[PDB]
Write a protein that binds this ligand. Structure first.
Ligand SMILES: CCCCCCCCCCCCO[C@@H]1O[C@H](CO)[C@@H](O[C@H]2O[C@H](CO)[C@@H](O)[C@H](O)[C@H]2O)[C@H](O)[C@H]1O
Ligand SMILES: CCCCCCCCCCCCO[C@@H]1O[C@H](CO)[C@@H](O[C@H]2O[C@H](CO)[C@@H](O)[C@H](O)[C@H]2O)[C@H](O)[C@H]1O
Ligand SMILES: CCCCCCCCCCCCO[C@@H]1O[C@H](CO)[C@@H](O[C@H]2O[C@H](CO)[C@@H](O)[C@H](O)[C@H]2O)[C@H](O)[C@H]1O
Ligand SMILES: CCCCCCCCCCCCO[C@@H]1O[C@H](CO)[C@@H](O[C@H]2O[C@H](CO)[C@@H](O)[C@H](O)[C@H]2O)[C@H](O)[C@H]1O
Ligand SMILES: CCCCCCCCCCCCO[C@@H]1O[C@H](CO)[C@@H](O[C@H]2O[C@H](CO)[C@@H](O)[C@H](O)[C@H]2O)[C@H](O)[C@H]1O
Ligand SMILES: *C/C=C(C)/C=C/C=C(C)/C=C/C1=C(C)CCCC1(C)C
Ligand SMILES: *C/C=C(C)/C=C/C=C(C)/C=C/C1=C(C)CCCC1(C)C
Ligand SMILES: *C/C=C(C)/C=C/C=C(C)/C=C/C1=C(C)CCCC1(C)C
Ligand SMILES: *C/C=C(C)/C=C/C=C(C)/C=C/C1=C(C)CCCC1(C)C
Ligand SMILES: *C/C=C(C)/C=C/C=C(C)/C=C/C1=C(C)CCCC1(C)C
Ligand SMILES: CCCCCCCCCCCCCCCCCCCC
Ligand SMILES: CCCCCCCCCCCCCCCCCCCC
Ligand SMILES: CCCCCCCCCCCCCCCCCCCC
Ligand SMILES: CCCCCCCCCCCCCCCCCCCC
Ligand SMILES: CCCCCCCCCCCCCCCCCCCC
Ligand SMILES: CCCCCCCCCCCCCCCCCCCC
Ligand SMILES: CCCCCCCCCCCCCCCCCCCC
Ligand SMILES: CCCCCCCCCCCCCCCCCCCC
Ligand SMILES: CCCCCCCCCCCCCCCCCCCC
Ligand SMILES: CCCCCCCCCCCCCCCCCCCC
Ligand SMILES: CCCCCCCCCCCCCCCCCCCC
Ligand SMILES: CCCCCCCCCCCCCCCCCCCC
Ligand SMILES: CCCCCCCCCCCCCCCCCCCC
Ligand SMILES: CCCCCCCCCCCCCCCCCCCC
Ligand SMILES: CCCCCCCCCCCCCCCCCCCC
Ligand SMILES: CCCCCCCCCCCCCCCCCCCC
Ligand SMILES: CCCCCCCCCCCCCCCCCCCC
Ligand SMILES: CCCCCCCCCCCCCCCCCCCC
Lengths: 230, 230, 230, 230, 230
């Protein structure tokens, strides 16, 4: 059971229920957008669904840990969700371009998918101590650099500028990725490589950031689906 | 297991099952209202769904507490649901205006959403002892004042008076918010700041009030959706 | 685990699974009746759903009780389901009249809903020892008298006689209510006020009676929905 | 946890997951057959759903029993599923005749339903030691004789011969009932009355036979629904 | 709870959540492909669903095992999923040929289904020590040889070459079966009959290979369904 002074556990509870709510929202609304937009909504629901399932597990772990007198929820177990949800979120950049009928190579899809996995496998390997934390940071920054380029100066960026319906959503989502998602590499540096931030602080931040970095991402996509389904 | 003479636990059981029933009702009926009304029904189902999930957790907590000989379910854990359900319920004021094709700025939507979060974060901070209870009450009353103004003298109020289909539902819902929802600030004053009411009494009241403050809210919205889907 | 020779526990298992089956049936078939009939099917599914959820809880309680050497499942916990399912079942009398396009005041709906809650709150208060068992019986008989009058000599009765499609279903359902449902006041008298029947006998009877008093009620409604959806 | 060399427990695991798979299949495909065939598919899904729920329970029981050093899963708990699933399966003989638009009295439906319950109540009473095992066998054989006659020489048999679309499915299903289902009375004789077969052997056989006696039954019905939905 | 440095347990967590995601994806998207393709999508969802349910069980087992100080998850319990999922995956070769309206005997369907079960029953019998591991390998290789022939030189192969829409998917899927699925017989030889590979290594490999051997299989099928649903 969650104790009352435990803000980390409160944050796990909040985000766990938010994510169940988000899942149902995307799935149920996805049934009522134009067919072109249905896949978008599906991906959003999947993202929130994986997160929900994992947060249900992770919250249990935390609470146990707090009863056993040493509260910890290691960042490394986050990757069980990130390995799935982060590639899904990134392919949404391709998917919504397709939905507005932008012309865009499938090469953009693979660039997005590989860059995302390079980024995550680098960090996971570093956190799981399979390789040096420095080497994991570098490999992960390479992945980052690829995805950032795709959506800020690469094909997907250019496709989005050509289309006008998606242009503004694309701009919102790419900002979340640029700025919203910067907490993760920051946690890896200051949390993990430097030890300047405790895991409990990190867990609160990561938990609260999921309102932006996943739910608001999905709601921006729903907003354009619904304006385009008109 | 729920013990004999435990009305608090009985109230948790009643409301927990009511809320599952409500969720399914809104989702299943939402499939059969006009498309304009589908989002309304979705929000209602989400509200009852979050509440159901949380009441399942909270009832477990209570029962444990009663076996351990000190029965308590602190109000603070209510905010895990309120932080999500209360903003959802309030945005229904915007959503149903849109469904009847009222003209209404999105500024009304943000005013509703911010005022609601100011209201709740103020109370949560006060209850979680992050700030003085007095300061949390004041900040929360500011949030309240904003939402009350929106639906009683602000844009949403005026839009609703212009439309005739939603006028009467809008009036019902705004009364629930004005009167039905007054139990919450009252519990904060008499329960928490004054200690004149025990948490067990509060928990019964809050549990029973969810029939009005959430379910009847949703059923009023369904009633207008169905009269307008004709 | 359910032990050998435990017919009470067997009855809980039977009814718990029947009710899950019934729920899915009503929801899945409700998707394929004429729109006029969809709400009926919804209410039936809700009734069986609440019952299923509660029987899952109650069966657990019983089994525990049998391991702890004193087998009891008090009737009072039945009211957690009855408070919801009984009003739902009774409003079906109004709903199916509306579905056949009978003319029927909403006053009939409120009479049904109030009479049902008077009936149950009276009994609950009596069991639960909030008031005398005698007084709870009387108050509950008042509720009964109201609902019986509505469907045997009141508006709903007359509406049903005017319509021919629903006439025969209405007659079946009102007989279940008159006769099928008489076990409940009987249990209160002989079980609770007189002590002439043990709770274990009562629990078997109540469990088995749910085949008639809820499932067959729902199947009669489905049968007319399907003959009218043609 | 399922232990090494436990084939009985392996069989429970296999069948439990098969039955979940079957349920989802029938429900999801039932959404895509002609409306005439939707009820068939519903009944099949219900059958597999009850079985799945019960096998989840029963497998837990077995595993417990094996840890407590005496492995037993008594046949008597099978009746909790059979009492529901066997009547459902048998009414499929009526339902698919209706789906092909055969002319068939509802008397055939009641004959099927009563004969099935006579058959099962007889066996249950015998196994639960409420009556002699001999008497339970006799009463159950009476039930059997009724259903066998209905589908091999009674109205349903004749209706099916008149129709050509269902003729061959009807023949397949009646053979499963004649032959596939003979394991059950055989287990009652050799298992229970004679003691010549242990419950563990019986449980393996019954578990494996559900591939034929329930799933293949449902798949034959789906096969004709889909050839008729063309 | 999943412990630190447990890559086997991490792999179980990853795959368990991936498979839930995959299930929902196939079911939800299957609602939006042409009717010809709906069964394909159904089979894919079933495959991932069984796997998910089993991985939820298996991960629990592993974690227990690691607390009890001897980490093992025997390959034999894999067959509880394989016995169902592998026949399903293989019949997809028939199903998608039907969906593109290829001419193909049902004999191909039975050849696929029998060859698959021969293959698995042989291995299961060998692993469960019911027969020699050698004999189980041989019997299983016979099953393999049948299915490989069907899709590389048999009817299904030839049908697929005649059609052009499915040709390329058929080629992708048959390569996964040829190459992707070779890990399983390899594990049986080197893992089980030779002991050259520990179960923990095997479990990681098998867990990770499900991204290819089940999910990517399903996504290739979805990709052709969606290009053909256009
Ligand atoms: C279309 C509409 C559908 C209607 C669906 C309504 C669902 C029913 C609502 C209640 C269900 C939730 O009920 C219960 O909630 C608690 C906490 O919230 C969950 O949580 C508990 O167990 C899980 C799983 O081990 C842990 O991760 C968690 O830490 C613990 O608190 C339970 O796993 C869930 O069973
Ligand atoms: C379209 C609708 C179709 C729906 C199909 C029908 C669904 C039927 C499901 C009923 C079974 C409910 O099953 C069980 O219910 C009990 C109470 O009843 C729940 O409750 C129990 O465990 C949860 C676990 O966190 C606790 O929160 C709770 O305090 C405790 O009493 C269980 O979590 C649930 O597993
Ligand atoms: C309609 C679309 C298809 C949907 C497919 C659904 C398949 C579900 C398969 C069965 C699920 C498991 O069903 C399982 O059954 C047993 C009893 O029957 C329950 O039983 C257990 O928990 C409940 C509630 O916590 C207790 O009341 C009970 O004493 C205990 O044994 C499990 O809680 C439930 O999890
Ligand atoms: C079809 C549309 C999409 C559906 C959603 C996606 C699939 C959902 C995956 C759920 C995974 C099941 O997760 C878990 O499985 C194990 C066995 O596998 C179940 O089994 C465990 O508990 C039950 C209930 O007491 C026992 O009967 C059983 O003996 C035990 O092993 C758990 O009760 C279930 O929670
Ligand atoms: C499709 C639209 C609607 C979808 C709605 C989605 C709601 C579901 C959200 C999360 C539900 C909770 O999901 C939760 O996940 C954790 C971690 O993976 C599981 O955790 C537990 O599961 C089973 C229990 O037998 C074990 O195998 C496992 O080891 C254990 O940790 C919980 O059983 C489940 O309760
Ligand atoms: C829903 C969860 C999200 C959006 C997670 C995002 C995670 C990242 C963007 C991770 C990035 C990393 C780098 C850029 C380098 C260092 C390693 C990582 C994995 C932390
Ligand atoms: C479903 C739950 C509901 C409707 C909860 C509503 C809660 C409020 C309206 C809370 C209001 C508060 C104030 C007005 C000031 C004091 C602090 C609060 C949060 C108790
Ligand atoms: C599904 C459960 C059902 C149909 C329950 C019905 C219950 C009643 C009709 C209860 C009736 C009572 C009276 C008529 C007076 C005495 C008190 C009651 C509540 C037992
Ligand atoms: C899915 C389960 C099935 C098909 C169960 C079938 C059970 C029977 C056909 C039982 C038959 C019996 C008799 C014919 C007489 C003896 C008693 C029974 C109940 C074992
Ligand atoms: C999703 C799981 C999959 C695809 C499992 C596949 C398993 C096989 C292809 C097993 C093959 C075997 C042989 C070819 C011979 C030896 C025995 C087996 C069962 C390991
Ligand atoms: C920052 C957003 C986080 C949301 C919290 C999780 C709750 C579940 C999300 C469901 C939200 C549906 C909201 C619908 C918005 C409708 C009006 C939009 C008009 C601009
Ligand atoms: C040619 C067929 C195209 C198939 C679909 C595209 C390939 C798969 C895309 C998967 C994206 C989600 C991956 C998340 C999990 C990654 C592994 C951990
Ligand atoms: C995304 C919003 C982040 C707010 C983080 C609040 C700071 C948490 C650290 C508190 C110390 C424990
Ligand atoms: C407590 C569970 C809520 C279930 C939904 C109640 C459905 C009521 C339908 C009202 C019928 C028309 C009234 C005018
Ligand atoms: C540009 C697209 C905008 C859509 C924005 C939708 C914001 C909706 C917020 C839903 C209601 C609040 C949900 C709870 C917030 C929880 C904070 C903790
Ligand atoms: C909202 C309903 C209020 C009911 C109050 C019950 C009395 C609680 C004090 C024990
Ligand atoms: C009389 C008791 C009924 C209890 C049934 C318990 C099992 C769950 C309900 C399944 C629903 C079965 C639907 C059968 C429809 C029969 C069609 C025949 C028309 C006369
Ligand atoms: C526990 C006591 C409350 C019972 C709730 C469930 C059974 C009664 C459901 C009544 C639903 C109708 C309420 C009125 C809605 C009519 C629409 C508003 C005008
Ligand atoms: C919803 C109904 C909950 C049960 C209310 C019980 C009323 C008790 C009245 C006691 C009087 C003293
Ligand atoms: C609905 C009919 C149920 C009859 C059950 C009889 C119970 C007898 C008491 C057993 C002790
Ligand atoms: C899937 C379980 C199959 C069990 C077969 C066991 C037969 C041998 C028993 C010794
Ligand atoms: C005798 C074996 C009967 C089959 C049992 C299968 C059990 C586990 C899976 C249940 C789901 C089956 C879905 C089958 C789809 C078959 C499509 C056939 C195409 C002609
Ligand atoms: C264990 C008690 C008996 C359970 C029966 C299980 C399902 C049998 C089929 C029920 C359908 C019979 C009632 C249909 C009535 C149609 C309306 C008149
Ligand atoms: C719903 C099925 C319940 C089965 C009960 C069977 C009871 C048989 C009668 C026992 C006679 C004892 C003398
Ligand atoms: C329907 C398929 C029948 C296969 C039966 C397998 C025989 C089981 C023999 C008992 C094994 C020993 C159990 C103790
Ligand atoms: C290599 C296998 C990759 C899939 C791994 C599974 C990850 C979880 C389930 C993901 C399912 C969703 C994939 C959607 C892909 C949409 C492809 C866009 C067009 C090419
Ligand atoms: C004559 C109509 C037959 C149509 C159904 C096809 C036969 C069954 C196909 C089953 C495929 C799933 C196989 C899983 C078997 C599980 C064994 C354990
Ligand atoms: C000695 C004889 C060995 C028999 C092996 C049987 C293996 C059966 C596995 C379960 C099959 C489920 C369809």
């Amino acid at each position: 059971m969650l104790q009352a002074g435990d803000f980390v556990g409160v944050s796990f509870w909040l985000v766990s229920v938010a994510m169940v709510a988000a899942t149902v929202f995307f799935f149920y609304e996805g049934m009522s957008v134009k067919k072109e937009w249905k896949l978008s909504m599906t991906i959003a629901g999947l993202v929130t669904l994986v997160a929900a399932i994992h947060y249900y597990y992770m919250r249990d772990y935390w609470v146990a840990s707090v009863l056993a007198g040493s509260p910890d929820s290691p960042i490394v177990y986050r990757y069980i969700d990130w390995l799935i949800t982060v590639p899904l979120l990134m392919i949404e950049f391709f998917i919504i371009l397709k939905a507005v009928g932008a012309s865009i190579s499938t090469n953009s899809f693979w660039r997005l998918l590989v860059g995302t996995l390079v980024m995550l496998i680098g960090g996971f390997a570093g956190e799981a101590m399979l390789i040096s934390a420095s080497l994991g940071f570098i490999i992960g920054m390479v992945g980052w650099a690829i995805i950032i380029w795709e959506i800020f100066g690469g094909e997907a960026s250019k496709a989005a500028d050509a289309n006008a319906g998606v242009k503004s959503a694309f701009n919102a989502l790419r900002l979340i990725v640029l700025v919203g998602w910067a907490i993760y590499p920051l946690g890896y540096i200051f949390g993990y490589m430097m030890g300047s931030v405790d895991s409990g602080s990190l867990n609160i931040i990561y938990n609260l950031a999921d309102f932006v970095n996943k739910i608001l991402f999905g709601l921006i996509i729903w907003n354009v689906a619904v304006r385009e389904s008109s």
